[PDB]
Structure formats: structure tokens, C-alpha cells
User: What shape does this take?
Amino acid sequence: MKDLVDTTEMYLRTIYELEEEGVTPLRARIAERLEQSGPTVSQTVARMERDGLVVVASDRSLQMTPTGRTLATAVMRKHRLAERLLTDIIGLDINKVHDEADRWEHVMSDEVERRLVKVLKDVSRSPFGNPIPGLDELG
Amino acid sequence: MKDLVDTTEMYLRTIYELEEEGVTPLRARIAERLEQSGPTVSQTVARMERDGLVVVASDRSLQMTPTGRTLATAVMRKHRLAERLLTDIIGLDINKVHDEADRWEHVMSDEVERRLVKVLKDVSRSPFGNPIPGLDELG
Ligand code: NI
Ligand code: NI
Ligand code: NI
Ligand code: NI
Assistant: This one.
């Protein structure tokens, strides 16, 4: 099992936060953030255009496709809902909530997600102030 | 990301239930159960003796080593504690609790585990009647 658990999902989540921040999704940005090497990020980003999860502009700009984005949103929603659960009901040290969520977000289901929304008190923001996207797709 | 999420952990969990049942941990048993092919189970079981997680007797019998076992126990404890959480606090359909746990057990931490025991009402049995092993190692 990979350390990122799910490479493809981690690149897509990253491109998303980078966007959320205002930054331009650039390989170099995914390389540092994910601490991924260069020809690592390259063949992986080069692997995403094959399945149509993104397009790299004639400026190395990373543009998720209507699907990549939908999936990034999915990964981002689980992640922040996981943090919400690890904080609100389990009580895991806030200093570990993230790393733990970085891991769960790749194995959580849509069903458990729908059940969390219903079981959780606040689903608009994560324990870190960020809004939780894609809840509309849930239901 | 692999479908088993964590191959090595899934073989070890399997050898464990097989033991729990009375069966002899045999490759063929891991092959059907895990639905893994043959030269798949072979090079993987053949990969476990390299890291010392098991020994294959002159009868193809699979004997976890003091460490393999400790890890199998760890995987089995998270699995059944996950089911307990997915049933007791989240309310996920019992018909999905397992598959979901089959997935989480490879990303759950010891810390979240320790917090579950404390947050969960019954930690002696899983939602399926099985006892939860290794709780002593937890704390
Ligand atoms: Ni986070
Ligand atoms: Ni992650
Ligand atoms: Ni189970
Ligand atoms: Ni599993």
C-alpha cells in the first residue's frame, strides 16, 4: 500500500486546494506539496491525461476535466467530513485529525458519507474552517 | 490503490480467520477466500517469508511468525472495531458494515483505536459475534 494510499486521488485533492488558495496548479506545486519527486509527478500527471482527469495547458497549467474535478470534490468532501467525525464524535487529538483524514478519505464510501451528514451536527465547515464541498452531490 | 487496499495485511488477516475457524492456513485457502489467483498467492506468500511474517512448512502449511501474528491481530482488531463504529455510532446498513471495514482496517490508527474503545460501549464482540482480539496491546 502506497503512503499516499491512493496517488491519483491525492494529486487531484492537491490541485483542488491549490485552486482554493488562488495558486496555479503547477507540477512543481504538486511536487513540493506532495513532496513527490519530478519524474514522479510527471509520469503521474502524464498518466492522468490518459484517463481524462486533467489537461496540461501549453504553460504546464493543470486543468482538471469535468470528471477530474468531480472526483477531486468527492475526495475533498470525504476528507473534511472525516476530520469532522474524528473531532466531533471520536475525539482524536486535533493534531492528528488531518493525517488520519488524509488516509481515510481514500476508503470512505458515499453511504457512510451520507450517514455522517445525518449523524454529524455541523457539516458546513471542517474542523479547520474550510467549507465542505460537494454535499449537494451526496443528497 | 489495490482493491485489497493492503495485500500483505489481507493475507495475514485471512490466515487468522482460517485459524479462528479451525482450518489449516493453506495457500489454496487464501486463494479462494481472497479470490487471489495461484502464482499471485505464491509470490505474495513467497514475499512474506522474506520479511519474516510467516513460514511455510514442508506441507505448505502457513505459520505466521511472532511478528506476522502480532500484525494479523492488529489488522483483525481494527477491522472489528471499525464494524462496531459503523454499526453503533454511524448507523451504516449492516449489509455494508463489513466491506467498509475491510477497507478502513488498513488506514485506522492505534490512537483512533484507543479512542474508539473509550468512545464505544461494547468492545468485546464485533457486530457479528466475534470477539475483538489484541485489545490488551492497545492499553
Ligand atoms: Ni485536511
Ligand atoms: Ni490522502
Ligand atoms: Ni468482518
Ligand atoms: Ni481489508
About this structure: Chain B has two domains: 3-75, 76-136. Residues 3-75 of chain B form a domain with the Arc Repressor Mutant, subunit A fold (CATH 1.10.10.10). Residues 2 and 103 of chain B are 11 Å apart (CA to CA).
